[PDB]
A paper describes a structure:
Sodium/proton exchanger 1 (NHE1) is an electroneutral secondary active transporter present on the plasma membrane of most mammalian cells and plays critical roles in regulating intracellular pH and volume homeostasis. Calcineurin B-homologous protein 1 (CHP1) is an obligate binding partner that promotes NHE1 biosynthetic maturation, cell surface expression and pH-sensitivity. We find that NHE1 assembles as a symmetrical homodimer, with each subunit undergoing an elevator-like conformational change during cation exchange. Each monomer is made up of a dimerization domain (TMs 1−3 and 7−10) and a core domain (TMs 4−6 and 11−13).
To investigate how the NHE1-CHP1 complex is activated by protonation, we prepared a sample at pH 6.5 as well as in the presence of 150-mM NaCl. Three-dimensional reconstruction of the corresponding NHE1-CHP1Na/6.5 dataset was similar to the NHE1-CHP1Na/7.5 dataset, resulting in a 3.4-Å map for the transporter complex. Subsequent 3D reconstruction focusing on this class without an imposed symmetry yielded a 4.0-Å EM map. Two helices were observed in the cytoplasmic region of the NHE1 protomer, termed HC1 and HC2. Whereas HC1 shows extensive interactions with CHP1, HC2 is amphipathic and presumably binds to the membrane surface. In the NHE1-CHP1Na/6.5 complex, HC1 and HC2 helices are perpendicular to each other. Moreover, the two CHP1 molecules reside at opposite ends of the rectangular-shaped NHE1 dimer, by interacting with IL6, HC1, and HC2, resulting in an ~30o angle between the CHP1 molecule and the membrane plane. We hypothesize that absence of the HC3 helices in the NHE1-CHP1Na/6.5 complex model is caused by the splay-opened CHP1, thus releasing the HC3 helices from the TMD dimer. A large funnel between the dimerization domain and the core domain in each protomer is accessible only from the intracellular side, indicating that in both pH conditions the NHE1-CHP1 complex adopts an inward-facing conformation. In the context of inward-facing NHE1-CHP1Na/7.5 and NHE1-CHP1Na/6.5 complexes, the CHP1 molecule exhibits high mobility relative to the NHE1 dimer, resulting in featureless CHP1 density in the EM maps.
Numbering used by the authors:
A (entry chain B), B (entry chain A): 87 to 506, 516 to 558
C (entry chain D), D (entry chain C): 11 to 195
Write the structure that this text describes.
Amino acid sequence: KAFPVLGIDYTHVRTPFEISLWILLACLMKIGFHVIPTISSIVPESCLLIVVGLLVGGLIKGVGETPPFLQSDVFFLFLLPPIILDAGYFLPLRQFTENLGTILIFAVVGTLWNAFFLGGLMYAVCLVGGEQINNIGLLDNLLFGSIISAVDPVAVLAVFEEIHINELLHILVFGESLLNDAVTVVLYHLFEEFANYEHVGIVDIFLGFLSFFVVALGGVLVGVVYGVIAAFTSRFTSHIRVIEPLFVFLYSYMAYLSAELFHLSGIMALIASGVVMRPYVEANISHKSHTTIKYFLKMWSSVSETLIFIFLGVSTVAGSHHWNWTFVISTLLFCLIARVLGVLGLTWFINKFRIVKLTPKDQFIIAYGGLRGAIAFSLGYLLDKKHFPMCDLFLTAIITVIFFTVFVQGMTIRPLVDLLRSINEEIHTQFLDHLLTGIEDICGHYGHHHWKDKLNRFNKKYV
Amino acid sequence: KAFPVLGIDYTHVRTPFEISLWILLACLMKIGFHVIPTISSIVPESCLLIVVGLLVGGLIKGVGETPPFLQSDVFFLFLLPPIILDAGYFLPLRQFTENLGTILIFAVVGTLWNAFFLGGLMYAVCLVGGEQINNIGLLDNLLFGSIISAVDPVAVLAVFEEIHINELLHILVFGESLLNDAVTVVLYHLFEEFANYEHVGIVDIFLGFLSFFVVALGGVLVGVVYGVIAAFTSRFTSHIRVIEPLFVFLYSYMAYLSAELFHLSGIMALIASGVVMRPYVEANISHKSHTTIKYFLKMWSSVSETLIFIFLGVSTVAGSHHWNWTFVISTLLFCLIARVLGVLGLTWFINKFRIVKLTPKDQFIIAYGGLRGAIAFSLGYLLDKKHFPMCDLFLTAIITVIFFTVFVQGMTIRPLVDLLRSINEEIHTQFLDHLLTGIEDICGHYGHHHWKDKLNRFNKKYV
Amino acid sequence: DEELEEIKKETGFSHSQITRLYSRFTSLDKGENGTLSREDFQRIPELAINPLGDRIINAFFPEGEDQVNFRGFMRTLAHFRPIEDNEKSKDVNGPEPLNSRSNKLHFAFRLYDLDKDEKISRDELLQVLRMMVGVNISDEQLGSIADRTIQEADQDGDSAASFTEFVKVLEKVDVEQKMSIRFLH
Amino acid sequence: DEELEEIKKETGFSHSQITRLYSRFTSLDKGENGTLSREDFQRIPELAINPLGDRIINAFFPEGEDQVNFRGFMRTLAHFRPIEDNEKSKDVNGPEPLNSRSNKLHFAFRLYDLDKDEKISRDELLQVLRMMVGVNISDEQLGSIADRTIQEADQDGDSAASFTEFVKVLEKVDVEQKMSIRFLH
């Protein structure tokens, strides 16, 4: 072996080198996606991720490499918490807690409605469907409904602008996307366990109903504990500042792993930890370190979403498919109907319980514009084959729903929704505002203003 | 199983959770290391890393967990390139290329001298040592000498200040640490392959001599190729700016993996890629993104060094030890003597070939102050047991050398070296400067000024 | 059940809203004899912090009397009851409801006006602005803001154009959303 | 071998340094007859860019003659030869070497001085400063800098204190390192 060291050993660097190649290709298409004059405001970013995944999967198929896969430990530990923490860190806590009621209604109740409505209707279709969609059952199909209701409406916000997206709809879709990705994972684990009980009684249904809230709220509690710890330890990192971002990421990640340790909701723990630490940081942290934290979250979430959509591409062009016309067409149509019915019903229920109503503009955007991706696919991809023997059909339905809801429901929402400050004003605005508040404080109904003032008193006390 | 989802599954989150715990402990000690009034300027940062590793290893030993280990793929692919890229990115290219001759002399030639002098003297000791250090041989012992000469003098710069560290000594130790970590890894792979030839002839010695330069310069060539590519693609990332740091990290990492693919010097490729891209970025990249890149490199290198020193702690308090008094004492004494002799001889050789001589101050700092760590340990820890049956003795010697060179040679260098601008001046300075230059341009000797002016003409031409 | 219907006709609330308000009333009574007075309002923890706080305490009161009965509290508080479209839309004869688009901005003018002389003036605007803003900001700054608002608002020419123009410059500002309170049952 | 020893005594170089310099000399001769002239120096690519470039071309020249021979180039260039301690230290009688701490700063003064009248003056400083700095910067700025340097430098009282004080304010500035060139063999 002349020239001893020299070699061409490529097995040593395949996973890191090819993952770097994928992230490089996705980044190069992003810098080839914002240079086209007006295309970032016509087509969502998720479409670019889909197309990048399709090209990478096509390259993998053409070369002949065995396509890589999510290990169901890399997703739930290394690829999910980036996305969740990026989403739930820059949550506008003011707007989020002002109308927290409607956000919780949409996210939790609308996600449960989507999940159970899709489960029931897909079960009804399977019962009366061909011999290759029978024997799916209820729990195996209700789990599919819960997976496919993991929806990301906030991507549609990229297609709009400051106009048509008020501070109400923006926070509504933002919180809906967050807590929907939380509730769908909670339901995913719940149904994935219920699908091996072989006897689901009423007592088991009640226990699952309790465990839903126990998982979610235990995640919230772990998150606030780690957020308080991060808020405290951020006061002392003024001496060494390149460690300031690291403490935020470490404490959020440890909150996620402490929630997932006890099988609580890691996503809700991540969200709660970020939301708790954010106000008490950015005041104890320098501007440079806060700007970094922002950049870190953005690009690390972008890398994670890129990787998820690359896996989607490689499993849609180079994977196993079990296309069923009845199941796939029914799931497309029923996802649209379940989403629309949930949005309409819940908006009707909550307009009468609030001051600022939800216009048909934002009702249409929420109902038509909730687009799947990067969590629906990954949740439906990590389904076992031993359990859920039909999981290839579920993957085909989920991929078709993602493509239809991103390319047809996201590329045809802006050209489908536009067709369906004097000095006085300022003075008076502040005036009416101080007026209403005083009045609300006189009547006394314990709305949200009272709670926020109590929160502020608590904050002062701590400080 | 009441409350279905709830569980206490900890095997799922052990590696991520415990690595997060370790990084959190190291960060908490860093924010407990800069709050003590005057201790960051008395004891180096490497001592804090050693102590953090010792505490984490002690906790692992006390609990009873099986101690984790470097997989020799995680180090050379995920833990080394952070450190190398952080070091070689903020390389002050001006000062580095001004006196490039002396930096290359120290790094390459002094590292080779340290490696071969330690190999020869340790071989001489083993030949006349006890029956448990015989049969080590030359190549197995010359490899140990090359591993233990992976030295990091720049850590000592933390103990000094702007005074006592001029722009010459600072760049000298910086480039020495970089290219020493490069040359020691090149020699490590070279000797680790030569240790299975069972017949090393003169033709094999010459082939290894050629392959040293082939590996190093092929790494440099791959690095400049990827640096040119990154410089080009940085012109177009103005539209999307959260991807600007990602392109730097991706292109440097791909340079590293392309060099390691062909078994070339990945470290030199990383250094060359960073050095090439840096001038042509930070001009095409916004200030926020450059500040991020800086923060990313600093904290990601800090995490990698933390992890390496944690592994050092767990393998020194909870590992296998083969302490030999002759070998360990001889290697301590001979590391000190080899370092001192190399520094003295090379400084004497290069003072006569330059204008600004090296004072006994900086000669003492380079000779006494080159402290091992985080690459010496890791290189000497990934040695096989099949090959190199004595590798436990090598690990014990390397750990002892790290502890002695960090705690005795780094804590007793500041209290061992302090005891052994009118308007005119400014005008005249610039004047004499413009004067000398003109003169050097008249005489014509092709020094470095000429080369730099040619480089500038080339840069203009490109732009 | 007490007498509630006549206020349920005068104000226009429902029964549960009135019951909850009367509950808060009894809680804030801190004594039956001071059914409701100025000090009774002043010792509410938070409104006194509000810059307009004192004006709000005297804005309910019809005349110089220092006592408010429950029914008068209802009459003054109804001004905020949200405008209900079909129910403002069902029968049209006279503006019996006090929560109208007119009465809602009239409460604003009565809160601005020093006395019930319908005179918003540079003194009035300057006083309320100095209340809403802190004491630190320059009087010349407040002078500029207040007199600029007077100038643009005044189409009367006497710098007043007080109510009729108040409505016109606030018409651009939806008050149906801005100034109304939903009182939970 | 040509005549080299007498320059090796006059200048104090070694033999290889002189050989390499003569090689560069022949390369820059671009013709034997113009052994070395003003234009011959001007067409060197880079020094003409240097602000002091023209002064350096006329600084070698002893007198108004427009030709430089090789030996004169050696005499003028030796001024930069690095001071060698033991070899400046071995025999002490008279300052035969021109590379001394005195002659090195005398070349500087001869480059500043307009003529060889030893007169650094506000005109001299202002001219050289306007050369080193660009043309954009204010003449009042240059006036401030130049006259402040004159004031601090001048202990003569005539604003000159030209050479004797030049040495004193530059003594704080090591010229042994700053102004000398090692000529590779």
